[PDB]
Every structure is written in structure tokens, then in C-alpha cells.
């Protein structure tokens, strides 16, 4: 399309909301934009015209698939496409957005319920999902495993929240505490990557590559 000049007095860009069949977060809205706009330009459009609070803008290229005229009584065998090439934009607003606008709904097909199913499904041929480490999970700016017992947080947390992790353990998916003396698994309760000092000494076994030498 035509390039955007420096000073824009009569913009022709047309912005619209796109109803996606996948699940979207609370603070996320899906828009349909041209294929000739930048992140910054998109940001400024919304910031100046609409005056909406914006944090992040993501962009994707959408290309329709090929189709063939095969059906009907008098098929032509000709190729075609449905829709048009566009930019799928995703805006991370400050405020929340209702799902009834952004997400689709249908009663005929009960399986089509992205809002209800949330991220439990992939909505595609993804047999295995992917989820990088979380902010809280990461070292930097991450929740501490030992900060709960600190004096300072408790002060803030006055009759308002319990920081003790022992009060939030699921009972239906936890095993009883075994004896150290007795053989036991590591993953049962040890949610870390270091051997506790409580555990007795463990022996080491070395493989024999040439036992015939004995």
C-alpha cells in the first residue's frame, strides 16, 4: 500500500477488531490492520486517536490458503482464495476486556469454547505445548524460596495473607513422608536440586569396562 508520510493530516488506515477462535488473555485484544504498519505507528494511532492505554503491541502476518473449485454440478477446477492478506495485531491494554467481544461462541459445536477451555487446549495440531520459564520462576525478579520467614514481609502481611507454604499443599496429590533410612524417591517431596544433609551417606558405583582382567 501507499507509504505513510511524515505529517499525516488525513489518515486512511482503518482499524477493526478480529474475532479469533483461540483463547486470549484478559489484557489482550486482537485487531486487523494493514500489512504496511509498524509497532510504533500502531501504538501512536491508538494513543492519539482513541487515546487508549497501551503497553505492548505484537504483529503477525496472515495469508489465506489456496482453494480449488471442485464441488458443485459444474466445477471449473480453478484455484482461488478466501479473504485477504492482513496483519493480525495483538494489543496488551492496561484495563480488562470482556471475552464476548474478542472470542467466538457457538452452541451447535460444544467443543468450540475457547473462553471456557482457556489454554488447556492448543486449537491446532500441537500435540505437545511449550511454555518457557516464568518471571517468578527465573532467578532475577523471581520469588524466593526462603523469604517467607523473613521479618519484613510479615509486617506487611498483617492478618491479611499467610506466607507459610505448608498451609497450601494439596492433600489429594501428595504422599506421606517416608523414612530416610529406607529407600525412597527424590521427587516425592524434595522440590529442589540439592541433596539434603539429613539423608545418610550414599555409595558410588563405577562401571567395569574390562572385567576379564580380574
Amino acid at each position: 500500500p501507499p507509504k505513510t508520510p511524515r505529517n499525516v493530516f488525513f489518515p486512511w488506515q482503518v482499524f477493526s477488531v478480529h474475532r479469533t477462535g483461540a483463547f486470549l488473555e484478559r489484557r489482550r485484544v486482537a485487531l486487523k490492520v494493514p500489512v504496511n504498519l509498524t509497532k510504533f505507528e500502531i501504538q501512536s494511532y491508538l494513543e492519539k486517536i482513541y487515546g487508549a492505554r497501551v503497553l505492548k503491541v505484537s504483529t503477525l502476518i496472515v495469508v489465506p490458503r489456496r482453494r480449488r473449485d471442485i464441488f458443485g454440478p459444474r466445477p471449473s477446477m480453478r484455484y482461488y482464495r478466501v479473504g485477504c492478506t492482513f496483519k493480525k495485531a495483538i494489543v496488551t491494554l492496561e484495563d480488562g476486556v470482556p471475552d464476548a467481544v474478542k472470542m467466538l461462541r457457538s452452541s451447535i459445536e460444544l467443543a468450540k469454547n475457547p473462553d471456557i477451555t482457556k489454554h488447556n487446549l492448543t486449537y491446532s495440531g500441537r500435540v505437545r505445548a511449550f511454555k518457557p520459564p516464568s518471571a517468578a520462576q527465573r532467578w532475577e525478579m523471581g520469588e524466593s524460596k526462603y523469604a517467607w520467614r523473613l521479618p519484613i514481609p510479615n509486617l506487611l502481611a498483617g492478618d491479611e495473607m499467610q506466607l507459610n507454604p505448608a498451609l497450601r499443599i494439596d492433600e489429594s496429590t501428595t504422599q506421606m513422608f517416608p523414612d530416610f533410612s529406607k529407600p525412597f524417591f527424590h521427587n516425592a517431596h524434595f522440590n529442589f536440586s540439592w541433596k539434603p544433609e539429613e539423608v545418610p551417606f550414599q555409595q558410588t558405583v563405577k562401571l567395569d569396562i574390562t572385567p576379564w582382567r580380574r
Binding site: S181, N187, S193, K195, D208, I209, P211
Partner: protein
């Protein structure tokens, strides 16, 4: 094949990891560890833990587990378990071998300056075939048909 072009030793290698010859001393070295005056610089433990594993000898009491941060291996960890230290398909008698595709044991021995190998089908039983091959080698050595 046991070709010359192979290491003479079969031990795990722990080569030295020398540092660049132009960098200054680390930051962790500026720490006062005295009982009276205590000073813990930033990332002191982080730097020192890594630095300790430079020599290659001081791998620590638990070397296989002091660097594997991945939970994949930790998940499988067990305590107070007895384990063997010998592969099932390894006879102590010299000259015995096993073949995966043929699925059979073989005995190598030299007679009159000529190499000869015998077949031992393991279809009837792994232990039975292994013991038969070992007994055949022992019979060879007892009757005196192996050069020495």
C-alpha cells in the same frame, strides 16, 4: 576395530580449563573471611562455586550431581539402593564375544598359528550359551589346544 589411532587409556578425561592470559583477578577474591571482619562481595558465592571447578581435581564429593541443574535427572534419583557394576553380556573368560545382529556368542583362540572362531547360538538361552562358550574355552585351555 582396535586400531592404533585410539587413546591408550580408557579413563574419563578432565582437562584443565585455563583462563585468558590477560584478565585481572576475580571479584570474589576481595572478600575478608576473618572471624572479626566479614565482607561478602556481590555474587561472591556464585563466582567462587564456579571458580572452584577449574583445576579439575577438586570435583567435590558429589561431582555428577553438583552441576546437573536440570530436574530431568533429579526426578529419577534414589537413595539406599544396591546396584551392580558389570554388564550382563560380558564374560570374564578371555576370548569370549557377543554379536548383536547374529545374536550369538563366539570364542576366539589361536591354534598352530591360525585363527579359529566357533559359533554358539543363544536362542535356547543367554546364560546357557554363555556357560557353554566359557566351558568350551576352559576345555581348550585344559586339553592344551591354545598357543602360549
Amino acid at each position: 576395530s582396535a586400531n592404533p589411532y585410539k587413546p591408550k587409556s580408557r579413563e574419563v578425561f578432565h582437562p584443565y580449563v585455563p583462563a585468558p592470559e590477560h584478565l585481572p583477578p576475580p571479584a570474589y577474591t576481595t572478600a575478608v573471611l576473618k572471624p572479626m571482619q566479614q565482607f561478602i562481595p556481590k555474587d561472591f558465592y556464585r563466582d567462587m562455586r564456579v571458580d572452584s571447578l577449574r583445576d579439575g581435581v577438586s570435583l567435590g564429593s558429589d561431582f555428577p550431581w553438583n552441576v546437573t541443574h536440570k530436574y530431568r535427572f533429579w526426578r529419577r534419583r534414589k537413595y539406599n539402593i544396591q546396584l551392580d557394576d558389570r554388564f550382563i553380556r560380558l564374560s570374564p573368560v578371555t576370548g569370549v564375544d557377543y554379536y548383536p545382529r547374529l545374536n550369538v556368542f563366539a570364542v576366539q583362540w589361536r591354534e598352530d598359528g591360525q585363527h579359529r572362531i566357533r559359533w554358539f547360538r543363544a536362542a535356547y538361552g543367554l546364560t546357557r550359551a554363555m556357560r557353554a562358550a566359557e566351558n568350551f574355552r576352559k576345555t581348550l585351555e585344559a586339553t592344551g589346544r591354545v598357543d602360549n
